[PDB]
Structure formats: structure tokens, C-alpha cells
Amino acid sequence: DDQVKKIDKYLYAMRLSDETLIDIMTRFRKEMKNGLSRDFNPTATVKMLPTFVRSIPDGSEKGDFIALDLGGSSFRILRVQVNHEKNQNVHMESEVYDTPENIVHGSGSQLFDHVAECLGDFMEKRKIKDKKLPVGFTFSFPCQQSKIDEAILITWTKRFKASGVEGADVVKLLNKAIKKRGDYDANIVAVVNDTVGTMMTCGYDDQHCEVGLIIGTGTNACYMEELRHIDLVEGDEGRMCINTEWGAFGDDGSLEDIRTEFDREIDRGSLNPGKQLFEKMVSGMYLGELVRLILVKMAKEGLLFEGRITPELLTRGKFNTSDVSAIEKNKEGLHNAKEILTRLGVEPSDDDCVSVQHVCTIVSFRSANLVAATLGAILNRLRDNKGTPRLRTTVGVNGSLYKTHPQYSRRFHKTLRRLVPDSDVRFLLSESGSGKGAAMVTAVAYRLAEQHRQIEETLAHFHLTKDMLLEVKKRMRAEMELGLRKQTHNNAVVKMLPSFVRRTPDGTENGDFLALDLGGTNFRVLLVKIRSGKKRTVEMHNKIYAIPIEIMQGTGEELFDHIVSCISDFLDYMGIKGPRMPLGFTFSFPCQQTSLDAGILITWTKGFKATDCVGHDVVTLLRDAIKRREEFDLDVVAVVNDTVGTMMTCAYEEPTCEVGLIVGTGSNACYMEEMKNVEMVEGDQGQMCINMEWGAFGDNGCLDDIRTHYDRLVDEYSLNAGKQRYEKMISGMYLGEIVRNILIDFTKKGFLFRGQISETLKTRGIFETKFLSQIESDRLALLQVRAILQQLGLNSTCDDSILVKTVCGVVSRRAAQLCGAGMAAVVDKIRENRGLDRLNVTVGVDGTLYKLHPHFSRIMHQTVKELSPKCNVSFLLSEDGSGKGAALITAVGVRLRTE
Amino acid sequence: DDQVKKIDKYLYAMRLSDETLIDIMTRFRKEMKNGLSRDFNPTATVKMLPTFVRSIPDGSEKGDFIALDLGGSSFRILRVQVNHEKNQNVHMESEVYDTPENIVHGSGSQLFDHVAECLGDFMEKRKIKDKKLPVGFTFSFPCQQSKIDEAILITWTKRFKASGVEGADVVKLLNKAIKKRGDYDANIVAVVNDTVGTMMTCGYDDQHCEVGLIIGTGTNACYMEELRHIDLVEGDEGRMCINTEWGAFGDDGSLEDIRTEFDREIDRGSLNPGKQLFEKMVSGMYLGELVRLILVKMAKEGLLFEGRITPELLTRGKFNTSDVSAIEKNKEGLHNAKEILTRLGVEPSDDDCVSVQHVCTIVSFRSANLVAATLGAILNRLRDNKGTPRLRTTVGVNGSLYKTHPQYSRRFHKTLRRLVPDSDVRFLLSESGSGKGAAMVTAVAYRLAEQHRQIEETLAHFHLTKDMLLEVKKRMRAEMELGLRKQTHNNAVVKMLPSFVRRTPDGTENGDFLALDLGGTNFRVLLVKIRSGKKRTVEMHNKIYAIPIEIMQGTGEELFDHIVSCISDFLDYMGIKGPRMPLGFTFSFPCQQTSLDAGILITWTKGFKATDCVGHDVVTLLRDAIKRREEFDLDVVAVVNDTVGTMMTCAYEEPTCEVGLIVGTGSNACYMEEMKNVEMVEGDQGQMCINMEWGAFGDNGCLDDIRTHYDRLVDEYSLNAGKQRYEKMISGMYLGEIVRNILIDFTKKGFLFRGQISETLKTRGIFETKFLSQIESDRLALLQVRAILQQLGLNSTCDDSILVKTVCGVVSRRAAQLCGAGMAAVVDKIRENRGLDRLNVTVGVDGTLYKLHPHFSRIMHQTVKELSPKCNVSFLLSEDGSGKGAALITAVGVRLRTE
Ligand SMILES: O=P([O-])(O)O[C@H]1O[C@H](COP(=O)(O)O)[C@@H](O)[C@H](O)[C@H]1O
Ligand SMILES: O=P([O-])(O)O[C@H]1O[C@H](COP(=O)(O)O)[C@@H](O)[C@H](O)[C@H]1O
Ligand SMILES: O=P([O-])(O)O[C@H]1O[C@H](COP(=O)(O)O)[C@@H](O)[C@H](O)[C@H]1O
Ligand SMILES: O=P([O-])(O)O[C@H]1O[C@H](COP(=O)(O)O)[C@@H](O)[C@H](O)[C@H]1O
Ligand SMILES: OC[C@H]1O[C@@H](O)[C@H](O)[C@@H](O)[C@@H]1O
Ligand SMILES: OC[C@H]1O[C@@H](O)[C@H](O)[C@@H](O)[C@@H]1O
Ligand SMILES: OC[C@H]1O[C@@H](O)[C@H](O)[C@@H](O)[C@@H]1O
Ligand SMILES: OC[C@H]1O[C@@H](O)[C@H](O)[C@@H](O)[C@@H]1O
Ligand code: NA
Ligand code: NA
Ligand code: NA
Ligand code: NA
Description:
The structure is a homodimer. Chain A is of the alpha/beta class. In chain A, a hairpin with a 4-residue loop joins strand 15 and strand 16 (about 525-530). The longest helix of chain A has about 35 residues, at about 350-385. The complex binds 1,6-di-O-phosphono-alpha-D-glucopyranose (4 copies), beta-D-glucopyranose (4 copies) and sodium ion (NA) (4 copies). One sodium ion binds near residues 227, 230, 233, 234 and 235 of chain B.
């Protein structure tokens, strides 16, 4: 018996105590939290990688899929077909391909050219080349994943070292190998670890399976973790499978007290020195070689084969795990040990076969014990998550060592149970291996990918190319020309209305003026005091007055009676009732003007629709309302568009400002044009500010080119169908409606809100400028997005919040680009009118959407620079409102008249 | 009585019950949580802005300071003196500069010019323009601050509306205006809110002060918050003052059930419509106007003055909060009301005076109650943070309304104390104002700014400009020439040694080869099998052997005996000892060679110093050690540098790979040069690979220009003082030591580790390549950095961690750039030598620092591309090791002698 007592004490270090296993286990439980923490993850050795698999198969999966399996003992390719609907039962064929150590160790090219060729052949046999089966990919290596169909190789392990793969996306690398053949096509929908595939396979048969275990060439385990614990994944909803990658357990010296001189030497001779340390003590790629080392040691010390040592006993890999197994058998063990040991050149005795068969026991028993330590850690984790006092679950398993060894399973289980008493665990052995689980993943992954493709196809219609935008620019310019030239003005959609403001402030403006601001989100009355000279100052006061929607769409008389009533109140408010003051009337609607003080409303726009107003001079309408009330008397000097009023406001201090831009409720622009071009106003001397009214761009159909199903719905249900089409693709009154219609469509398709269109989503105007702006704020937590939505009335999930956010971004991005294409046309025209190679010009801007949106102005600016590279445009924010400019305009109006 | 009854039911909406107050208080409670949360902040109206003030005065403050105060009712500039020393401990003089509405409502340029002018006048009179008086700046508006000397205006409030300021750093704007004047200098070191200044001023006299409160023109409050609750500021250590900006409470509609029609009208006539709604129900700017609006509503409805109404009564601002106070006098109350109302043109009856007074009562009382609810929320907050049942604290207060109203203070206090039962609260009125507290902040800020200045000065010596880098390149080029021309060679520091490898692999290499890899972090022996012809493959194995340090520095006899001891062990490992296999020897130290198999160690580098090696032929040394053991025999065909081996490994695949680079323990480079230039070896036909041994670059003082005090310490304490200087600014064995010496320096200065040089910090090697790479990892958590450092033995606060990271980054960046200037010199030589206008070449790279560092390679590549534009360099990473390239050299060698 000293035959055994001897070795046992010699290999003292490789016989782990139950107390020791407990320590290891506790230490792995910690390593898990480190891998799951967003703070310690970057440093942790156990990477706890997220897999993006939400749960084991339920039986709804159906279709036809191809699965690849590389990184294991065999490079296999299967075909899984399932459709319970038709009563097809899970069915699958497979085939194994030869892969020499040469390829596994060559360039990434060779390897993936080999895989692409093997897939080509596998599909040629079943002749499925035609046909578009979704491909799954079991890749048994630690991988960086942001989505299920992406796999950045973190590091080769086991038998692989292929140059130019680590830190690359194996999905992309594989694809490249395929396309290079042009032999066929392949839609790689997913990549999973073999642990994950194994968990899914057993999960399919055992609804309790919450763990995936692999103990073959290498070792590693995955399990079902709570989202509320996966710091590195946005969400708290449900659970996700986490590939622990515990092979690298101790790669940082965590297990230096457990490792032995034998582990350190196998390490020094390994393909990946210093890495996968915990694994190098466990998996069947190392076990046999670890034994051969322990023997050589003894033999050199004469404890075996007398003192004998042969070139074979020293040759790396002469002692397989196959032998560790064959020698472990109950009846044929010693007989096998004899044969194997004999072929080693040595003259083994029956005493030797007994000693050697025992070394295999100490090395074989340790591995099983270590795994029981770590797997016990996982189980503890689970029981914790559940809250249940006891634990009951299934553990999928696989791997040559676990399958073939005649003592491993039996031992490992026993130890695990002992370590974890309150755990009622069943071990289910994957038979199809990873493949069925892989297919069950691919199915879910393909299904989700189909939605994405459809969502992307729809959203793609909102994407405009550099060239499309140049066309838009070009069409805008053409329309401008049409509006200016009198022989074509009557049919031009872009009216190019003269404002009769011939110059920006010259600093001689002086006096006290009243002003109106009507047409924006706020109607207001102002008092503006302007003083010129050495000491120039501007003093203003505002009061916002509400206009009830009823009235806003009542009669002309009502509307202006209300306006005049509000003026009356304001005059009282400023304590200035009595004297007849000059008034600048900012009226944000297309007006045909014959002089500064006359403007005939061409048509209502935005939300305004008062009766008996269109066709009337709004200055006349105001004067009438003033006379009717007969309290005070005013001297209406001018009617001005908000674009023009805004440009003048900014021009006050910025003499390079010759363009006005509004992006708020509506959208429109104005600029200084040469009189020789304003064919609609007699005279070709000096300049005139032109109110473009560019919102009507596209009203003749010149944009049907880029308008979508959703734009037409918005236009068709508006107060002014067929009109202001360009504006309806840009301004804050409409962007929300575009988004809303997209969401209604997506919900019906079943992509959003469980496919149930809430009463809220049917409410028009729900997505106000304010909401759109909040939704798109950068680095905003999905949690916050979901909060905003639910606070509107939309009960959405994280996935929904993402989609909604993507939709808002696409609509607002397009609005910014379209706006930029228009502005691009404008500045380029100015540049040419001036005969310049390069033009510096500033635009005075205002509008709630422009001010609030976190991306609009940025993207709009980038677009203008991109489309008119010969112009350097500066955008200047108006912070005083149009009233200031209107007052400045009224001043010049009073002087000129006074002549 | 009958009167008070009527009014009471008419303004019932403004009579706030305690239940309501408690409700409002709970509301503010939640708003605080939202403002502090990283998730909800972007949508919270209560911004909870960090102030970067860690605590109230600790008594160590002293110096002469200037303080600005803008945003209150008076623009004020002060001078504060604090010394110990003298006493008068705190002495201060101030002046109030007139600031008309025009300045407050005009351009930002004009506003800050005005401020800069006043600051000038103030400094002129005190003739202190020449002193270095630090300036603190009290700016009472909500600001975004990442550091105490930065203040980005979020929004104007109260009476201010100056264009071009919101979204800008007011510190920059002010400096800008100051530099425009060219009148003087101003070191603005800190910006604080008036709440903060108040808290610090009161905190100076009362060490229990934890809150600063303002109830004047506007209303706000700050308080000491735990850092663990401040999501937007990384850190959990200590506390920081939080500026709540509670004026904007309700701006999202959260208080619409509290706001009345009168509040809504006040808003519509306000300078900031829709903003600071809570503030508009509270502060002195609004209370009076709020009263006037109510008198108007009543007069119209007949409830006051027989229904009489006058122009003065209807005018904005005619009823000041000053009248509200006077009319609430105890006192002349009804009397004062008589006169105020009599000036308003109305015909006030004694009952009118009573009615009016009771109105003022409701309005002002609501204000005090609202403030008590929000302050209560803060008090409750402070208590929970302590975790105690009772709370004792002092609230610093200031503001005209609170100082002058005859009832407010009393009512506010009573209600507050009622809302927060278990708390003893002292209200300490700040009589001196914000100046004293501002100066206190300025003292600490300045002290800190001084440390930053010194740190930035030191680190600045590691910054290299584009132009400096071009010089390094130029100098490198000259050194290369010296090394190549035989007339300057002997004295040249960059040796440009010949390797006697004349061509990259031609693809015909074939056979089995032994290889040795000595000089890197790992000593190893490799077996390389190169099959060429139709099919070309490369199968290689290897084992790592340790070399015990003594031996590394013992005798050439022992070193090479060990080397051979290992070579033998490996032959057994591969199970092939008998044949005289050809061997490639990678020895990475400068070697003077006459043939491919002759290598005379010129000098040791890195950590090697075995005796009786230098001056010998390392091949002769190896051949001896082999002959002594007598066990077996081999045929050493060549001795190669790791740069040459690496180049050949990478050029096996890439035919444009004509350059080698190593950035690991040491740093060096080789390249294919033209024999016409290799003056040291006979002939001018074909090419020759030159091992530059560029590490010695600078050993003749040519870099003394950029070497720092820390470079000199590292060099002077090394095993090879005065040699490998360039390498000592680049490679992994040294960078850590540069950082360590900087840290020791900063620690003595007292910038780091509480000025305690630990035993750990005194240990050399502490900052190994591995650690340097972890600590600089992108988007890594500060917590993670502190963890790594703490695990080294260094007790580091979060600030410490910031500095150490910054230091590591400065050092690695310079290393990458210096390396880049070297490569730029090399490639550009190839180009010029081959009379090309553009050159495309790839460089084979290896080395742990290069592989592990998160930025080195990226920055290096960038520098190469910037300094040698006419060159397009590709960096192919070697994953096979130098052994492969060595075997490729052996091959060609073995062929040459028979052939
Ligand atoms: O073992 P197989 O070929 O059925 O393959 C099965 O087990 C392997 C692990 O064990 P080994 O490394 O011994 O292959 C897994 O990697 C593979 O995904 C699975 O299909
Ligand atoms: O928005 P406000 O009231 O400051 O008003 C400002 O911008 C409006 C457009 O933007 P929106 O339609 O978003 O109001 C203009 O019509 C208005 O003249 C201008 O003073
Ligand atoms: O009031 P001051 O000039 O002593 O100034 C004091 O109180 C002001 C607030 O109260 P108000 O808005 O009523 O001025 C603060 O802004 C100022 O920092 C403080 O020194
Ligand atoms: O680093 P290894 O062991 O792969 O070794 C590799 O890199 C070393 C440089 O880098 P370091 O000094 O960091 O080792 C080289 O000297 C060695 O020839 C090469 O095979
Ligand atoms: O194949 C079993 C295991 O081998 C390990 O080396 C890999 O890192 C794992 O991804 C895999 O699960
Ligand atoms: O308010 C911005 C713009 O809205 C457009 O719909 C109106 O037709 C324009 O007159 C106005 O400039
Ligand atoms: O001055 C008292 C308060 O007024 C508010 O309107 C400002 O936003 C605060 O920054 C300031 O503390
Ligand atoms: O091993 C990397 C480099 O280290 C330098 O210090 C040595 O002098 C070189 O021979 C070598 O190329
Ligand atoms: Na999560
Ligand atoms: Na004309
Ligand atoms: Na913090
Ligand atoms: Na020569």
C-alpha cells in the first residue's frame, strides 16, 4: 500500500482540501462581481462577457438554419430544421471537416479561407447554395460583443494562434473570406460561445436549464444572470446569458498558491504563456501532458521504471488524455497502462502500471474538483438571485474529457453536490452538442434581424445623399430665380416677396416705437426705445398676450379686435396711453406688399385660419380695428415678416448680417437682393430684402422626389393640404407628426409597443418641439428616454425607447439637412451677386426648434459648409426677438415718409 | 373683520395650508434627487450645480484679495484682507459702481467691458494695479462649472438679459474685456454664486453653517452635499457645496396647481417668460408687481376704491415691494398705505388701506411659506445625510426683502421650524455680504491654482512641439550618417551595425531550424520548420526558460552554460537530440559582426551584466558552453538582433517590410540599407540590413536639449549610466521610472499623497509596463485608477489618481512621439536614398510596451505620418516572435556556404 501512500504525499500539492475548494469558490464568486461591475470589469480576469441571449428556447423557434462550430476538438457544420406548426420535429444533419495544425496556427486568412471553403462545400452537397439559410456560428473563444452578430476576438486560447484575428471581428473576417470566393452567399446572423450553445441545447429539453458547462479541450461556463446586474448592458428588464470565461481565472496570480511547479512548466511550454491558467489545470488539452511531466520528474528521481528514461518519455505530447482515460478504466485500466507505458520505450513493471494509473487519478481528480468549486460559485449566485431558500436547476454539459473519461463525471458531480448542499442540480448531457442550441439562437436572432432590416428600409427613405442635397440646393436656386423674374413670378411657388427694407441699420435710427409680434408661438406687444449717436442704446419691454384657438380660427374682425384690445392693455401697462405712436407690425405670413406699410395676406400658414383675412391688407384690418375701438390712435408705419425683423435685429450690431432664418413653428428665410434682380419692384438701384417664403418650396411637386409616405400623411391631414411642403419637412409644428406617423406604422407592423396603438399615439401634436429636443439629448440614459415617453402616455420598453429615439433622430437630421440645402442656395446666390470667389456672411436666426434642438443647428451648419464650400457662413442667434428689428425698420420708415 | 374676510376668500388660492406646504416640500425633495442623478439631471429643472467648494473656511485662509459682485441689486467691487498676523483678522473696503439698465440689457461685450472698466477704476484709486491680488468673482446666475475658475452661463435671470453670454464661459468673456483695455492684469481664480458666498461668509463665524440662502431680487439656496450623492462629479470622498438654483422649481409645470392667474400674468410681462416660476412667487423683484396686478383686478371688479382706476395704477412697476414692506409696518402700516395709494391717483378710503394691507400680507406670507417648504426639504436632506434623528445647523442668509420686510423673517422662520420639527436652526444674517466668503473661496482657489501652475510647468518640459520633433528627426538622420561613414564611425553613438543579411526572404527558405531568443522579457528556445516550394508552411514550437537574476549578472561561463543546459532540455522536449541541427541565435545587444555567424558583444544594455562577455564573440561563447557539456552538438549559423529577426518574420509575408522596430524592455530599429552607404563593409552591390542600435542616440549629448531632470535621475541610477539615453525615454523598462521620479518630486512639493513619500514609492520597478497600460486605459473609471494604485501600496485619493494618470500620459506620449521622430528619420532616408517623391514601406513591430499600451502605437504612427509626409508607412505587428525571422536568416545562411 506504500505504493500509493508514497505518491499521494509526493503530489501533496495536487490534492485539494474541501476547505480549499471552499476558498477557491468564494474567490470566484468575487471575480464574478468584478466582471459584472462597470468599474472593475476592465481589470477583472473573469470577463463575464454578455452574450445577448435572453433565455432558453421555448419551442416557438421555427425555420431552417446552418450552424458552424469551430474551436472545439472538431470543426463541424450542421443543418437544423424545425417547424412545429407543420409538425416537423427538431431535425439536424452534420459533417466534420479536417483542419491541420498548420491552418489553426497560420494566418487569419488561411484559417477563414478554410472555413469559407468548407461552408461552400457543405452547401454544395445539399445544394442549398441557392436559398438563403441563416448561419449560426459557435466560436469557443472569449469575444467582445455589442450585438449578437458581432464577435471581436479578445484572445486565442487552447490550440489556436492565428495571426491577424485578435482584436478583429471574426464575423467580418469570415464574410471577407466568403466574398473572396464569390462561390456563394452567407448571412451570419449570430455568434455564440459553445457554453452558450450547450446551455441552449439542454434548455430546449429541460426548461430548468440555467447553466452551460464545457469541459473538453478547454473549460468554461455560462449562466443566466439578471440584467439589473449586468452593468455593461443598458436595462433592468429580464435576464441575459453571461459567458464567464473562467478559463482565465487566476491569470493575475489569484491562484498562485494553488498552482504547482508542474502547472508552471506546462505553462512555459504552452501556446499562450501566462494565460488561461485555471483552465491549464483542468481541460483535456493539458491533463495528459501534465501527467507526462509528473512522471518524467519521478523517473529522473528513479521512482519509476527503476531509473530509466527514454527520448519518448521526454518528448512533448507522447502522453495523451486518451491515455489518462484508457488507464482510468476499471477492468482494462492496468492492462492499458502496460501497453501505453511499454510503447514509451520504458520497461514498465506491474508496480509501475499501478503507480502511473494513480498519477492519472490525482491529476484527473483535481480538475473535476476545481470545476466543482467554480460551478458551485455560479449556483450560489443563482439561488441568491431567485431568493429561494433551496435551489433547483439544470446544468447543460459537454466536452470530450467529460464524455469519455470513465471517472470524471461521477467524481465531479459528487464533489459539486457536497460543496453545494442546498442545490438540487441535474446534469443534462448535450448530445447534438452545441448545434441545436445554436440554431435556437440563430432563429431568434434572424427574426429580430428581419425587423431591423424592415425598419432600416423604411428609415432609409429619410436619408439624403451629398448629391441629393446638391440637387435640392439646385432646385431651390431655380425656384428663387422663378420668383424674382416677373414673367414667371405669378406661377412661382417660392414667391420672393419684396419687403421694402432696402438696407440694414445705419445707426441713425432714433425714437420710441411700438411693435407687434404675431405668427410665432407667442403673440406679443412691445415698446422699443432707440437712441443713436456717441451713446447708442436700445430699451425694450414685452408682454405676451394669449390668443385662444377659437379666435385664431374665428373671424377677421374678432382677431384684430383682440389684437387692438391687447395693444390697448399694453399702452396702459407701459403708462403711455394717449399720444399717437408709430408701430412696426411683425406679421409672420406671406404678404404681397406695394409699400412698407401695406401688405395683403396671400394665404394663411401654420395653424392660423381666420376668416375674411386672406386677400385683405393686414394694415387696413388693423387700422379698422383701431378705429372701431376708438380709444387711442396709432400710426402703423410698417408690416414686416419675422425673417426680415430677425435679420434686422441681428444686423443692428453685426453689419455682415444680410440673411434672416426662422426655424420654429414654421420655417422661412430672407436675404438682401440686388434691385436689378427684383423685377417685381421698379428700379435696379441699391438693394431690397426679399422675404422668400421658402416653405412653399415643393408645392409644385419639385420635391415629390424625396417626400415619403409619412410626409404625405402629415400634409394631407394639415389645415393647408398641398401647401408649405418644404416647411412641413423642417419646422417644429410638423416634425413630431412625421415621427408620430412613423411610430403608428411601426406599431401596426408589430415593431413597437407590443403592436398596440394607444389612444395617446393617435393624438396629433403629441411630439412637440420640446419633447423631440429632450429625446435626442446626447449621452441620455434609455431610462430617462423611457421616462419621457411614459410621461407622454406611451408605455414603452427599453427596446422601444431606442427605436423611438432612432426615429426622432432620423427625422430631425433630415430636417437640418434640407434646411441647409436651402440656405446653401441662398448664400451662394449672394456670393455670385457680389462676384466673389469666397463669401463671408452671417445669418440672423430665431425659432424654438433651432434653439432647443441638440443637433439641428449643428447638422444644419455642417450641411451649409459642405454644400457651399465657397461661403463661410456665420449663424448669429437672435436673443431680442423680431420686435427690435421691426422697430429699427419703423424708424427708417418714419424718416423716409417724412420726405 | 368683514373686510379681511372678503379679501381672504377672493385670494384663497394664495393661502397655503401646511398640508400643501408639506406637499410642495416633498416635491422639492424629489426635484433635488433628480438634479443630482446622472440619469434625470438633463431633464430636471432644479439643476443642483456643483460649485467646487469642498467646505466652509477652516481658518488657514490669508492674503490680499479682490472680489467682484454682480447680479444682486448693486454691482460691487471689494478688497478683502485676511491675516493672522494682523487683526482686523478680516478687513474689507468696497465700492458700488452705477450699472444702468442699458448695460444690463445690452450686449455681453458691453456688460463685461463695463465691469472691466470699473475694476480698472477701482484698482487705480487703490493703486494696487501692480500687486498680484487674486480675484474672486461672485456672479449670481446659474452656471455650468467643471472647475472653480470656470463659469458657463446657463441662463440669465432676474433683471439681466445680455446678448452673447448664455452658453459662454464668463471667466473668458471677462478676461477678454480686460485684455482689450490693456489697462492692467487680473488673475481671476474663482467664480461663485451669491448663495455660496453667503454660506462662506457666515461659515466664517459659525462652523455649523451648511446652507447659504438668498431672498432678495431673486431667490436661491446652496448647501453642503455628500460627494457620494453628486453623480456629476466623480468621487465619494467628502462633501461639496451644491447650488440648487431653486428659482426654476416648477418650470416644467410641476407647480401649476400652485400658481395663480396673477402669477401667470406676471410671467407674461417678465424678462424671462416661462422661467424661474418658483422665484416669481417669492423674490423682491416680483412681490410688489404681483400686488399691483391684484389691486387692478379688484378695482375693476369694484372690490376696491369704488371701482376707480388710474393710469398710475395700471402702470408696470408703480407698486414696488418696498411699498409692500412699508405697508406691513406695525407701525405706520395703514398710514403708509394711505400715502402710497394716494400717490397712485386713486381715492383711498380707510377701508381700502386695510384691504390693500391684507393683500400685501397674503402675497408676502405666501412667499415666506414657499421658501420654508423648499428650505425644509434641504434641512431634511442634510439630516438624512447624517443619519441622525435630530439636526443642528446654521443657515446663512442675505437679500433685501429678508432684511427690510417687517414681518417676513419672523413668518418664514416660524413656518420653517414648524415644517421641520426635530431640528435646531440658526439663521445668521450676512451683514458684510458675499465679499468675505468670496475672498475665502479665492484664497483656497489661488493656493490650488499655484499648485496646478507648478505641475503644468514641470510637465511642460515633456511636451514636444511639431518643430522640436522635426529637429529630433534631423538629428537622428545626421547620427545615422556618422554611423555609416567609416571616418566618423568610431566616434558615432548610433552605430548602424551590419547584420550581414542582404535580402528579405525570397520564399525558397526550407528546412528545420533551432532558434534562441535572448534579451527580451522572455528567454526561449524554438523549433522552426520551413517548408517552401509549391506549398509553404511554417510550424514552430518553443519553451520558455527562466534565467535566475544572479546568473543574468554572474559570469559568461555560467550564463552560456545555463543557455546550453536549456537548449539540451528543449532538444529532449522536441524529442530530437542526435543530429547537428543549424541554429539561429537571437541576441539583442549591440554586436560587432564580421560575418553572419560572428558577433562580438560591444556592451551590455538593459538589465544584463554577466562578466567576461563584453568584447567576446557570443557565438564563440555558445560554441564553448556546448563543447564543455559534451552531451551533443549543433551548428550555429547566425547571430541576429531582435529587430532584424522581427523584420524578417514580418517580411516573410510582406515584401515591402524593409524595417524592424522593437518597443519593449528596450527600444531599437533596423532597416535595409544600400551597400554603397555601408562604408564599414567592403562592396557597394546589393543591400544590407543595418541594426541601428538607436537606443544610444543622445549618448553624445545631442538630446540634452530635451532631457529633463527626471530623465537624468533615471539615467544616473541605471546599470549603464550615460548610455542608451534615447531608449531610456521610450522603452518599458524605463518609462515607469521616469514617472516614479516625477511622483516622488510632486510628493515632496506636497502635491501628492499628503506629501508622504511611501516605502512603496521608493521601490524601483513599481510602474511596470503592465500597470502603465492599465492606468491609461480609455474611459477607465477614476475609481478603477485609485484601485490599481492602492493595490500597488500607494494610498491615493481621487485627486491623486487624477495627477498620477496625467503624469503617466505625459510620459508615454513623449515616448511615442520621440520614437516616431526616429522612425520618421529612417523611412525618409530610404525614400531620399531611392530618389523617390513618395515611398511605401511597412515596418515589422514587436515589444510588450508596444502591444500592451493603449495609446503608444496610435500616437507613434501619427507622428511618423506627420513628420514624414512623403512616406506612407504600414505597421505590421509580429505575433510569431523573432525566432521565425531568425530561422529564415539561418536558412539563407546554411545555403550560402555550401553554395
Ligand atoms: O466534442 P464535439 O466534437 O462533439 O464538440 C462539442 O464539444 C466541444 C467541446 O469539447 P471538445 O473540445 O472535446 O470538442 C464544443 O466546443 C463544441 O461546440 C461541441 O459541439
Ligand atoms: O419664439 P418667440 O416668441 O421668442 O418669437 C421669436 O421667434 C419666432 C419664431 O419661432 P417660434 O415659431 O418657435 O416662436 C418669431 O416668429 C418671432 O418673431 C421671434 O421674436
Ligand atoms: O444686497 P447687497 O448689495 O448687500 O448684496 C448682497 O445681497 C445680494 C442679494 O440681495 P439683493 O438682490 O436684494 O441685493 C447678493 O446677490 C450679494 O452677493 C450680497 O453681497
Ligand atoms: O516579448 P516576447 O517574449 O514575445 O519576445 C518578443 O519581443 C521582444 C521585445 O519585447 P520585450 O522586451 O517586451 O519582450 C524581443 O526581444 C523578442 O525577440 C521577441 O520574440
Ligand atoms: O471550449 C471551451 C472553452 O475554451 C476556452 O478556452 C474558451 O476561452 C471558451 O470560450 C470556451 O468556452
Ligand atoms: O414663422 C416662420 C415662417 O412661417 C411660415 O409658414 C410663414 O409663411 C412665414 O411668413 C414665416 O416667416
Ligand atoms: O441672487 C439670488 C439668486 O437669483 C436667481 O435668480 C439666480 O438664478 C441665482 O443664481 C441667485 O442665487
Ligand atoms: O531588445 C530590444 C533592443 O534593446 C536595446 O537596448 C538593445 O541594445 C538592442 O540590441 C535591442 O534591439
Ligand atoms: Na444592465
Ligand atoms: Na427692380
Ligand atoms: Na461623485
Ligand atoms: Na560598403
